Amino acid sequence: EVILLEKVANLGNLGDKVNIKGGYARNFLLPQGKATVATAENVAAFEARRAELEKAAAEKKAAAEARAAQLSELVVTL
Amino acid sequence: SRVCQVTGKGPVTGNNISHAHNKTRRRFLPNLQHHRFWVESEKRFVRLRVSAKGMRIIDKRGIEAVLADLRARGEKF
RNA sequence: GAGUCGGCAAACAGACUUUGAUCCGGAGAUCUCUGAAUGGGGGAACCCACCUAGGAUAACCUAGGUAUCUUGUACUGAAUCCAUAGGUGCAAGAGGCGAACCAGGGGAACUGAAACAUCUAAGUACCCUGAGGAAAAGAAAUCAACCGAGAUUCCCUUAG
RNA sequence: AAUGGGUCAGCGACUUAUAUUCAGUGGCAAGCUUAACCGUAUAGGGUAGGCGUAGCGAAAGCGAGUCUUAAUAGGGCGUUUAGUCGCUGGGUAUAGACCCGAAACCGGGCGAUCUAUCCAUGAGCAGGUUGAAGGUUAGGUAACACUGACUGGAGGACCGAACCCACUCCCGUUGAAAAGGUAGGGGAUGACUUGUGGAUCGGAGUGAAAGGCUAAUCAAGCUCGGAGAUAGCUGGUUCUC
RNA sequence: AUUAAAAACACAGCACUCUGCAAACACGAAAGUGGACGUAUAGGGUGUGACGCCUGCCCGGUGCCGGAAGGUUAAUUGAUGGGGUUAGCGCAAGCGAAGCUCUUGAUCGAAGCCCCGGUAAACGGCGGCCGUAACUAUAACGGUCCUAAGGUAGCGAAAUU
RNA sequence: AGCCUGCUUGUGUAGGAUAGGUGGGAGGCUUUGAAGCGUGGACGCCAGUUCGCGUGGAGCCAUCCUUGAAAUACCACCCUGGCAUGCUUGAGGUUCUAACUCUGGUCCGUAAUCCGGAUCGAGGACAGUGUAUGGUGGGCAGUUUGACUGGGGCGGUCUCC
RNA sequence: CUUGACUGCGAGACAGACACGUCGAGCAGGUACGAAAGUAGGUCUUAGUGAUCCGGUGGUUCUGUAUGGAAGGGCCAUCG
Structure with missing residues (x-):
C-alpha cells in the first residue's frame, strides 16, 4: 500500500x-x-x-567510492 | 481527561453482571495511547493522545486532514 | 391643583409652595465601598500600587487606563537553517446570580417482595454541566398488509 | 401494689385522588353512556371508546355448540325472557392511606477553635543533691598496665516548687462544678510541658492500642435531603339513641 | 477526656521475612506524593520484649518458597455433523447444487489446581485405648493400636490444680 | 502445518529384475538399449537401480522369452519414502531500531528540580495501558444463619401408615 | 394363555377450608382367558410420597407478528 523509493536496504x-x-x-x-x-x-x-x-540515486554508490577509502585507514589515535 | 483527541471517545459506564446476575457498576475506558504522528507539510512530529481506532482514522484520512478538524474544534495540536 | 418637608412617631423647630411645590409616570445625571470583583494582595466591605494626560511650592490632586481566558489580528522569533513554539500589542466575547421548567453526564439507599441475592424502589433522590423563553424532537433507510396512511410534540382511548 | 393522666384552656387521629365491586336511589332502555376536545362555556355538540344484547374451546374455529378418540357412541360449560350511565353509602386496589413512634440505611455538605497524632516557629522548667566519661598530676611499670589525688560535670539520674498529671480517702451527687474540691500522692532536662499558625474527616482520619479520640455526641460525628423509611409491634382514636 | 493507670501498651535488645531503587509499601479513578532528596550497617512489615542460662520434637493440614513438565482448565479459534429456507431435475412424490442462516463444537489456548521437594522466632501440633503400678485423670513400662510427631531442658497445687 | 518444478528411489512367494497407477503403446533400431566381464560414485525391505561404460560412435535387460493375482520400450498425468528451495500461516531464542517507555545527561521556551520541545543515552517491540478472559481475593460490601419447646439453650421432632 | 397392571369415559356417593384424595357400570377401540353364565379398569385392605415455575423428549389438527415456511408458543403424553 506504499510506494518504495530506495534499494540499499534488505x-x-x-x-x-x-x-x-x-x-x-x-x-x-x-x-x-x-x-x-x-x-x-x-x-x-x-x-x-x-x-x-x-540522477541522485545513481551517484549514491558513486559518492560512496572515495569516501570509503578514508574509512579503512584506521588513523584514529586513542 | 481520558478522551481521544481524534474521535472524542470518552469513558462509558455500564454493569458487571456476575453469574448470579449481580450488577456492579463499572466503567468502560477507551484504549488511549500517546503517539507521535509525522507531518510532512510541517516537518515536525505531533504527539497526540489518541484511541486505537482513532489511529485507524489517521491511517485512513491522513494526519494532515485529521489535524485540519482538530483545530476546527480548537484543540492542542 | 393645594398642600408639603417618607415610616415606627405625636409633637416641635426652621421652612418650602397658585410666579404652582409635595406627590405621580417617561427620560437623563449622580451612583463611595465590598461582591463574578476584574491593577496586586486580603481575615468581603480593607491594604498597597503602577502607567499616561493635565493641574499643584520639598505633601499631592483631577480624569482615564492597568485582571484572566477564549477567538481574531498585527508585530516580534527559541533550541534550529527555514518556521513552529513562545513573547507583546490591539479589537471582539465569556465568567456571576436566579424558585421551577429543559437537554445531557454521574448515580443511591431505606422500602416492597411479608427473609433475601435476580428484581423493585428507580434512572427516583442527589451531585454536576450546558441552553432557552420555552427547550428537546422533527420532514420517513416510519408504519402498515397487499388496502393504505405520511414529520414532530401533546391530550384521550385501545388497556392494565 | 399492672399502664397512662398534676390541673385548666386551646389543638390533636379513618382523609383525598384514581380505578373497581356491592347496596340503595334515579334517568334512559335492547340499548345505555360519552373521553379528550369544540363551545357567545354547568347548555349544546363530540359516541373514538367502554359495557350490554351468545356462548363454548388452549386455539383455528363452530355457533344456540366445541373437545376427545378411528368413533355424530357416552359427560362438562352455555342456551327461550335487561341492561347501562349517574348520584349517595359499605368494601377493595394503588398512593404517607386512622394518628403518633424506632434503632438504622443512603446521598450532598459542615467541622481538627475540643481532642488524637503530625508540621513550622516561639519559651517554660525555684532550689538542693549525686559525681559518668574525659582530663591533669603524682606513684608504678619495657611504653601498655594499674592504684592515689585533683579536676571535670554525664544522666529518658535523685529530692523538691512552678508546671503537667490524676493513685487514694472523704465531701459533693437537686453539686460551687454535665467530672470539681480539701488533705495526702506521680513526673518534674525530657519518649517533658506549653503558646501561636498549619496538615489529615466519616467504612474516613488519628491512635506508646482503650473501640480510644475526631467540638459535654463515637462498634462509624454533625447537619440537611431520600423521608411521612419501615414497624406482623406499642399507645391513642372525640356526639346520642 | 467522664467508674479500670495495671500484670495491659510502648521500649532498648532479638529474630523472621519482603525490598536492587521509577524499591517493598502506603495515599491517590490519575497525574502525583510519601518512603527519601534515603539506597541492603537502608527502608517496610510481623512477632518477641533489658539481661543471664537457653530456645527440644513435628513439614501431615494450611500458607509461603522453589520444581519439573504430565493430566485437567478460560476467553479466542471454528474442523466435522445435524437442522431452516429454495433454485432446479423428475409427470408429480422427491431430493435438492449454490447461497444465506440456526445450532453442533474436533483442534489451538496460560496461570491456577492435581503432582514433587523444602519451610515452624510460618499459622499450627506435641495422642487416647484399656487392663497395668498407684490414684481421682499421668509415656516408667510389656505395650495393643494410632499419627506428621507424641513433649526435651526447665518448672510445677502455679496470675494455670 | 500447507505449497512447489525437473520429479529421479519401487529391492515380498516367484519372476534374469520392478510393481503407488491408469490410457494410446507391441517393439525399443535418434550415438541399437556400446557390450560379456567390469574401474570409480550413491544407496541396500542386502549383492537392486542411475550417471563420464576403463576404452567411445559396437547387439544388450528378451516388448509372454519364462514367471507374477496387473509386465518391461514409445509417451501424457499424479501421490508417496520425499530432495534442494523460492511463496508462506504457527510456537522459540537471542538480535536490530523506528513504535512505546525513561521518576538519565544536555539545550531552549525561561529568571523554573513543573511541563513541553529539541537532542544524547538506556531499555525495547518487552514493559505498560485499554478491552476480553481464567485464577486468587474477608481488603471491602449486601445478606442469610427455620419452627416446635411446661422460659431459652442442648437433644429430639417436623411428611405418610 | 401369554394381558383388563386395558382406551374413552362415567350415574352417584364418601371424605373434605382449599389444593388434593377415595369408591364405582353400560357401548365401542377392543381384549386374555372359560367350551359357557360370567369374572378382569392391578395386588386381602389401609404406608411406599412432592405442588407450581423452569427446562428435556415424542406426538399434534392448534398458533405461526407482510405472505409461504420455519423459530417460538399452546394442547396431549411422559422425564428430570
Whole structure:
C-alpha cells in the first residue's frame, strides 16, 4: 500500500507495491521520506517525475567510492 | 481527561453482571495511547493522545486532514 | 391643583409652595465601598500600587487606563537553517446570580417482595454541566398488509 | 401494689385522588353512556371508546355448540325472557392511606477553635543533691598496665516548687462544678510541658492500642435531603339513641 | 477526656521475612506524593520484649518458597455433523447444487489446581485405648493400636490444680 | 502445518529384475538399449537401480522369452519414502531500531528540580495501558444463619401408615 | 394363555377450608382367558410420597407478528 523509493536496504524495492504490517508503514517507511500511502492524489504526479530520480540515486554508490577509502585507514589515535 | 483527541471517545459506564446476575457498576475506558504522528507539510512530529481506532482514522484520512478538524474544534495540536 | 418637608412617631423647630411645590409616570445625571470583583494582595466591605494626560511650592490632586481566558489580528522569533513554539500589542466575547421548567453526564439507599441475592424502589433522590423563553424532537433507510396512511410534540382511548 | 393522666384552656387521629365491586336511589332502555376536545362555556355538540344484547374451546374455529378418540357412541360449560350511565353509602386496589413512634440505611455538605497524632516557629522548667566519661598530676611499670589525688560535670539520674498529671480517702451527687474540691500522692532536662499558625474527616482520619479520640455526641460525628423509611409491634382514636 | 493507670501498651535488645531503587509499601479513578532528596550497617512489615542460662520434637493440614513438565482448565479459534429456507431435475412424490442462516463444537489456548521437594522466632501440633503400678485423670513400662510427631531442658497445687 | 518444478528411489512367494497407477503403446533400431566381464560414485525391505561404460560412435535387460493375482520400450498425468528451495500461516531464542517507555545527561521556551520541545543515552517491540478472559481475593460490601419447646439453650421432632 | 397392571369415559356417593384424595357400570377401540353364565379398569385392605415455575423428549389438527415456511408458543403424553 506504499510506494518504495530506495534499494540499499534488505528488501527495499522501487516499483513494487507491497502489503506490509500496519506499524511498519506508520513509524519507519512514511516518516523517513521512503514511501507514501497508496492514494490517487499524486499517483499521476509520479509519472512526470520518473527521470528526476535517475540522477541522485545513481551517484549514491558513486559518492560512496572515495569516501570509503578514508574509512579503512584506521588513523584514529586513542 | 481520558478522551481521544481524534474521535472524542470518552469513558462509558455500564454493569458487571456476575453469574448470579449481580450488577456492579463499572466503567468502560477507551484504549488511549500517546503517539507521535509525522507531518510532512510541517516537518515536525505531533504527539497526540489518541484511541486505537482513532489511529485507524489517521491511517485512513491522513494526519494532515485529521489535524485540519482538530483545530476546527480548537484543540492542542 | 393645594398642600408639603417618607415610616415606627405625636409633637416641635426652621421652612418650602397658585410666579404652582409635595406627590405621580417617561427620560437623563449622580451612583463611595465590598461582591463574578476584574491593577496586586486580603481575615468581603480593607491594604498597597503602577502607567499616561493635565493641574499643584520639598505633601499631592483631577480624569482615564492597568485582571484572566477564549477567538481574531498585527508585530516580534527559541533550541534550529527555514518556521513552529513562545513573547507583546490591539479589537471582539465569556465568567456571576436566579424558585421551577429543559437537554445531557454521574448515580443511591431505606422500602416492597411479608427473609433475601435476580428484581423493585428507580434512572427516583442527589451531585454536576450546558441552553432557552420555552427547550428537546422533527420532514420517513416510519408504519402498515397487499388496502393504505405520511414529520414532530401533546391530550384521550385501545388497556392494565 | 399492672399502664397512662398534676390541673385548666386551646389543638390533636379513618382523609383525598384514581380505578373497581356491592347496596340503595334515579334517568334512559335492547340499548345505555360519552373521553379528550369544540363551545357567545354547568347548555349544546363530540359516541373514538367502554359495557350490554351468545356462548363454548388452549386455539383455528363452530355457533344456540366445541373437545376427545378411528368413533355424530357416552359427560362438562352455555342456551327461550335487561341492561347501562349517574348520584349517595359499605368494601377493595394503588398512593404517607386512622394518628403518633424506632434503632438504622443512603446521598450532598459542615467541622481538627475540643481532642488524637503530625508540621513550622516561639519559651517554660525555684532550689538542693549525686559525681559518668574525659582530663591533669603524682606513684608504678619495657611504653601498655594499674592504684592515689585533683579536676571535670554525664544522666529518658535523685529530692523538691512552678508546671503537667490524676493513685487514694472523704465531701459533693437537686453539686460551687454535665467530672470539681480539701488533705495526702506521680513526673518534674525530657519518649517533658506549653503558646501561636498549619496538615489529615466519616467504612474516613488519628491512635506508646482503650473501640480510644475526631467540638459535654463515637462498634462509624454533625447537619440537611431520600423521608411521612419501615414497624406482623406499642399507645391513642372525640356526639346520642 | 467522664467508674479500670495495671500484670495491659510502648521500649532498648532479638529474630523472621519482603525490598536492587521509577524499591517493598502506603495515599491517590490519575497525574502525583510519601518512603527519601534515603539506597541492603537502608527502608517496610510481623512477632518477641533489658539481661543471664537457653530456645527440644513435628513439614501431615494450611500458607509461603522453589520444581519439573504430565493430566485437567478460560476467553479466542471454528474442523466435522445435524437442522431452516429454495433454485432446479423428475409427470408429480422427491431430493435438492449454490447461497444465506440456526445450532453442533474436533483442534489451538496460560496461570491456577492435581503432582514433587523444602519451610515452624510460618499459622499450627506435641495422642487416647484399656487392663497395668498407684490414684481421682499421668509415656516408667510389656505395650495393643494410632499419627506428621507424641513433649526435651526447665518448672510445677502455679496470675494455670 | 500447507505449497512447489525437473520429479529421479519401487529391492515380498516367484519372476534374469520392478510393481503407488491408469490410457494410446507391441517393439525399443535418434550415438541399437556400446557390450560379456567390469574401474570409480550413491544407496541396500542386502549383492537392486542411475550417471563420464576403463576404452567411445559396437547387439544388450528378451516388448509372454519364462514367471507374477496387473509386465518391461514409445509417451501424457499424479501421490508417496520425499530432495534442494523460492511463496508462506504457527510456537522459540537471542538480535536490530523506528513504535512505546525513561521518576538519565544536555539545550531552549525561561529568571523554573513543573511541563513541553529539541537532542544524547538506556531499555525495547518487552514493559505498560485499554478491552476480553481464567485464577486468587474477608481488603471491602449486601445478606442469610427455620419452627416446635411446661422460659431459652442442648437433644429430639417436623411428611405418610 | 401369554394381558383388563386395558382406551374413552362415567350415574352417584364418601371424605373434605382449599389444593388434593377415595369408591364405582353400560357401548365401542377392543381384549386374555372359560367350551359357557360370567369374572378382569392391578395386588386381602389401609404406608411406599412432592405442588407450581423452569427446562428435556415424542406426538399434534392448534398458533405461526407482510405472505409461504420455519423459530417460538399452546394442547396431549411422559422425564428430570
